[PDB]
Amino acid sequence: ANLWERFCNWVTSTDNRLYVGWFGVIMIPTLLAATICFVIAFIAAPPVDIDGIREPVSGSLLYGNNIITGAVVPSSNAIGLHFYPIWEAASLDEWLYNGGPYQLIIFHFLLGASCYMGRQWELSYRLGMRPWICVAYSAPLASAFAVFLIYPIGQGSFSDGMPLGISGTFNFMIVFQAEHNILMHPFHQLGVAGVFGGALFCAMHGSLVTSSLIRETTETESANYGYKFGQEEETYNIVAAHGYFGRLIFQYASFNNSRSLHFFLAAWPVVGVWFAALGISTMAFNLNGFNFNHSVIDAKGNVINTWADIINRANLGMEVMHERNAHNFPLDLA
Amino acid sequence: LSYSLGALSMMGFIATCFVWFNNTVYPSEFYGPTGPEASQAQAMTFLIRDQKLGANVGSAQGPTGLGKYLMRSPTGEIIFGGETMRFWDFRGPWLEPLRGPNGLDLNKIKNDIQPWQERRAAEYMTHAPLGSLNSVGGVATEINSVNFVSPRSWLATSHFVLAFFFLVGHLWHAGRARAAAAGFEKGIDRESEPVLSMPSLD
Amino acid sequence: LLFFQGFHNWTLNPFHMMGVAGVLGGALLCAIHGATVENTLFQDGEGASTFRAFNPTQAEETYSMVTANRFWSQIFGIAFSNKRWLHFFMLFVPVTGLWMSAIGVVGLALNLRSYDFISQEIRAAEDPEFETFYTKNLLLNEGIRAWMAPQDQPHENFVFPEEVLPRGNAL
Amino acid sequence: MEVNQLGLIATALFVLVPSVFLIILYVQTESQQK
């Protein structure tokens, strides 16, 4: 066996503690780069002029942030969607003033996570599994693309990409509400049903299986010791759990098929989150949430407010206050 | 089928960007102004207005210290001021007559702006591709009155959705194609479970 | 939701944050567990649609826990090995999440908010060049409060003249 | 910055006390007759 052959055999080896694989060949360096840059920046990066108006925002710990306020700050509005690698800056000091760490991190991370998905496919193949775990992973991945790549493209600047930080995330959500009324967008609503629902079903499944565990232990020991890793017998009575749930609602609202049930458990949150991602991705091209502003009108023509109009007032607050020095003209068009 | 689904995904993303940015094969006369285009057009509109009122737009300093109407690109070209600084790559037939070798030309701005340009900039500024799902034109906070969502928004959003689901379809059918060709798409052989014939990880 | 953002800065609250971690983590577990079971199934029928290849009365596991465990051990570094623990955990994460969120709201009942970081405010008040996403979001909250209060709280009979409304440039 | 001066000892005990609890239970578990 030649050198390249051996190398290929190691790369794709089912025996490595962590699987490498060809997707992993791209994954490992890109994710390391993104990780290292992110840690160093989060700790020690100087303030960044996110909105290209010479008003630098401090994101790092050493420059006045804690964990909750800290962020790696998005690249400058002056840059727009321009590619700004380290070697495009005249100096690292410039690079940092203009928010280069952000581009470095989100591109390495996006490539890396894409390869992470591919690697899930790859290992499933190497182990003789069915292939679609990666498809489930496509939902959070797509979300990440939505907020880090797509929305910046639609709005024409990485300065509007989601900040790599907690409070900055909140900033992104509030501004997004201001300009897109995302709460009134059915794809975000499907996203909420996705995650509220996924949480619900998580608790329900968890509690039903836990409820029907077959007695295998004493009261003085954890019931978990009643399951042994690899045992061929199922560790709970699904007939009992089905009897329970079926009687909780009615029989034909309950799953008697574990496969059908688990497929549901995959599909509901995955599809929901897919719609959340598509929500951000299409609001990226300014197709916004439902606008029922001033929709109800009395017989003279007086506006009769609905809850929609109160939402609109809130949105106005956010709109007028956000990026308070960045707009010179009356319409915030991007 | 999976190969073609991947290809179509790719093409859908591409068409999204095409209808969103290009105004050559998607003329703004028919499809409306691009996002960049309308933002630029606003800058232009208010430059024209204020300059009519007597303002020197080249030397007008905005609140940030950056020019209120005109500023430089990161490589020095003269570009429109305000947030539309992001959109300085925009090019369109109504703006280019004002463009010199170094970008926007201040003399050309002062002396050479024809009424048709003011018109076009006003039109495009007021038909920016912003609007609601029930086709209320404008920012999310605008009141009902204008029935408008740009064709560029409709095309871009529709095709990003379709391209995405088509990527999903490519992962699905690719993975399935692999599994089925290798013969375990229906599940694991209990009497021949591969992981059981593998050395433990630890 | 928007009221709680503007008046309580609810997103800054670590109990809400634990809530979010519980709901999103819950959703994640829902997804990852369902998908994993569906993709470590034993071939128990001849069908290409594999749902009929399961008997509700059958004794044997319908999917391979061992293969699932190796897969995730190699993908993510760690994996469930115990089914009972897995399903208990699935109960624990969202239930705990919602409970924490509750505690936070009980705080908000008294206006006992996590609204500010005092050190942040002292620095920013003394230094007009110090800016963070924290202070940015407070500006947003201020806008929300002043622009929504009059119609949202009509019993207060608020009249805020134009000139007092907080606004940035132009908008 | 003008942080709370008890923040450090608060964080320190918040981590150390329970972590130590767990370490004690773990180590005495390992030492039990296998």
């Binding site: 700790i43 804690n66 | 990880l201 | 465990n69 051990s73 570094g77 | 964080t11 320190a12």
Partner: peptide, 30 residues
């Protein structure tokens, strides 16, 4: 001290990742 604390807790977490992954109790089939 704030920064030192934050960075320290983070570092402990990363170290925990290391031990939990490479020094886990190995799963064993019965």
């Amino acid at each position: 001290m704030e920064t030192i604390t934050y960075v320290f807790i983070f570092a402990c977490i990363i170290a925990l990742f290391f031990f939990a992954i490479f020094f886990r109790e190995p799963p064993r089939i019965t």
